[model samples]
Target chain A: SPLMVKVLDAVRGSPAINVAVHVFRKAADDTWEPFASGKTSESGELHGLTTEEEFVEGIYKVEIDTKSYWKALGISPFHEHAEVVFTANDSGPRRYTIAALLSAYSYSTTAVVTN
Target chain B: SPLMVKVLDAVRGSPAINVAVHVFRKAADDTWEPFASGKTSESGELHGLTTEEEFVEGIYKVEIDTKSYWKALGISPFHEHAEVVFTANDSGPRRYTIAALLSAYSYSTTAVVTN
Candidate 1:
């Protein structure tokens, strides 16, 4: 897998399960085109978003539907969503794992990119 | 003061120093009005953004200039910048500390909200 995501709930200190994620790649004209979408699994991991060959060098955006995640747990959150945007594979093909921590009022994201 | 921020450089495993920060409070008509702006101290913290009395119930946006931080270190980064937007002090007066971890390619933010 070229891209993956791991989500954790900071408030509960547990994996944030079943969070919706939408991935987008920036097109030539500078508009974001949808590439892939999925939901986090039991361990809060979402893999298989794209292959190494298909995920060529480009700018990508990962949108996490955090509002829905908190709402599912009967909490009213602040932001409508959370976004992670970056330019990938600029130097070479790389695998990326985005680690995100979430709360009703805030969220954090870090990335581990490996060749 | 009601709001603060702590930024860490994940790549270097140290505090991110002198990172620029801009804060905005959403107006009644939904425009982001500049509330405060400052740079992180040597300890990676930005304090005294606004007093509790001035930081009333509203939506606030905190923009972190990660690009500048990386560029100053002679490294090229991915994202143009990073943003944290949320509603504040809705239930009552509260203190918020946004803790952010940053890499060249990614960033993560978590908040400690206390009454």
Candidate 2:
């Protein structure tokens, strides 16, 4: 299930706010690597980095800087941060679409695999 | 924002296995109402039912019949099943892409908002 990862900011409170995202992969030895990173555009879309070649078969995690991101908007998030971890199989030609929905109060993540 | 939901099975083991999915929305009094349901196609893709007018602002949950789905394949899943709960605001025109990735052992859900 070797695939590419796509990330998106699914907030609708404000269109002018910007959000930043960071992705990390857990190594076999219990280490973490800075696999990919990107920022959400004004429209809340961020093209995920392709993991087909960059990532090996293992577990990966995505972290969002919700604290700073929301602070810029003069608002405080009820939740300070959010993280999502998922397993990946790098054995075939597959694509994984991962997205996040966030607001000043809550957030959630979903992962999907496609050919 | 009022939106539609899309669900997909992100598995990559065998193409012959079939998966069934059920969706429900929480009413104002904390009761769950069956809103939509579908099954994953041979390719693990399931187009979510349109919720533009059917779903009102509230919390919604998705349940996957992983037990029976995997059992039909003659495989025992480490996890019996999975559920994803999310909040929906029906104030404007919006689209929410919710997807799930599952294997015999683990699963995850991600939510995204789009115009």
Candidate 3:
């Protein structure tokens, strides 16, 4: 069985707001690096990052730049920012969906895997 | 001191994917409801949801429909789905930011506030 991940809609506020996503990979020593970068579409979706030929079994982390993204909108934040870390157990070719939901003041993440 | 929140993007795969956001408020009984809903912009940012006139101090939850969103892409998932819950303290007229980061297989959330 393989897994599918998706990140959707980094948001803020009651009506919900948007932020930025910075993707990273964890090395053996537990450091992080940028693997990919993108923003959410008006529909709150960012797809087509993982390909069949490029994915490898390992650990990964996605960082949200809450401070700067909000500052760009002319607002300050309570928390500096936050990050989500997960692992890809299946190395085979599969589709994964990981979704992230947000508001101008709080946020959350969800992962759905499929083969 | 007040707080602000933002939801940036919901992504999948290496490049990223798009998903929808379902917002809920925790009642005194600890249930949830649809407080607000929207999609992410192409820049991975959602703004203008928090208004100075309507914000109040309380707890909130944002749920990501990772299962159905990914299913729309015609892909199965590794996990069923996930959720993120947060709280809001400042009741005054202040700005806040919250952000969520996601991939097709994993996700994360962040929050920021300012006055």
Candidate 4:
């Protein structure tokens, strides 16, 4: 299965702006094991942040540069990079999509198995 | 010190549109002990999410409904909420302003003590 990670603007609405993205899979010892990481495009999208290998049933995580980006804007009275954790099912579409919405004060991420 | 929890839109670049906020203090046991929770104003601001009582030097947390808000707008392939943790200093100003910036894809929060 393939994974597509995306970033967006939750406030004004629409694809977010610039930022880097990091993805990881929970290891057996409950540690975050990194798989892939990179920067997002102008559309606030990281089209495919990982390989198209089939995913297993376990927890996956995503990290973004929430702090640095906001600081670049010269306003950062919030948290550093925002991270979201979720579970991957054994039985689901091969293509899983994770779309995250980021704001200076808030953020949300959801996962789904797309076709 | 008073803690001002705020929400905003990082995309269009301004106060966020709408969202709920939750606050908590790290207890002695290192657990997130709930202190207060509420919704943001029209300006995407939660002026006073907590009591004005002098805050202690410790860890504080803020939570927001990043998922629900986006879903309400008919787009939700993201996570449920975003949370940030930071420390409070005993020698700092009594008023701490925590303004969080939120976008559909990213977020950042920095804490400061103001006069």
Off by over 4 Å in 1: A10-14, A25-35, A48-56, A76-80, A103-106, B10-14, B25-35, B51-56, B77-80, B104-106
lDDT by residue (tens digit), candidate 4, B1-115: 2777677776556676667777788899868887877887877777756655636667777777777776766654334467766666656567776666655544555556676
Off by over 4 Å in 4: A1-82, A86-115, B10-14
lDDT of 3 by residue, A58-96 (tens): 676665565566677666654344455556666543655
Lowest lDDT sum, 10 consecutive residues, model 1 chain B, at B85-94
Interface RMSD, candidates in the order listed: 2.5, 6.4, 6.2, 5.3
Q: Best by TM-score, which number?
A: 1
- DockQ (CA atoms), all models: 0.39, 0.16, 0.17, 0.17
Error of 3 at A75 (Å): 2.8
Best by DockQ: 1
lDDT of each: 0.84, 0.63, 0.52, 0.67
lDDT string for model 2 (B40-115, tens) is 7665555655446676677888777777876776668888778878787756437665555566787655565557
- Reference-based TM-score of each model: 0.74, 0.50, 0.43, 0.55
- 1 or 2: which has the higher lDDT? 1
lDDT of 1 by residue, A1-115 (tens): 8899989998888899999999999999878899988999989999887887788888888888898899998988867678887778657547888888887767778778787
What tens-digit string does per-residue lDDT give for candidate 2 at A1-115? Answer: 2433333433543332356667788877898888887776765555655545676677878777777877786778787767878787756436665555566777765565556
**Which candidate should be chosen as best, given lDDT against the real structure?**
1
Clashes in predicted model 1: 3
TM-score of chain B for predicted candidate 1: 0.95
Model 3 chain A poorest 10 in a row by lDDT = A1-10
Q: What is the DockQ of candidate 1?
A: 0.39
Model 1, residue A105: distance off in Å is 5.7
True contacts kept of 4: 0.21
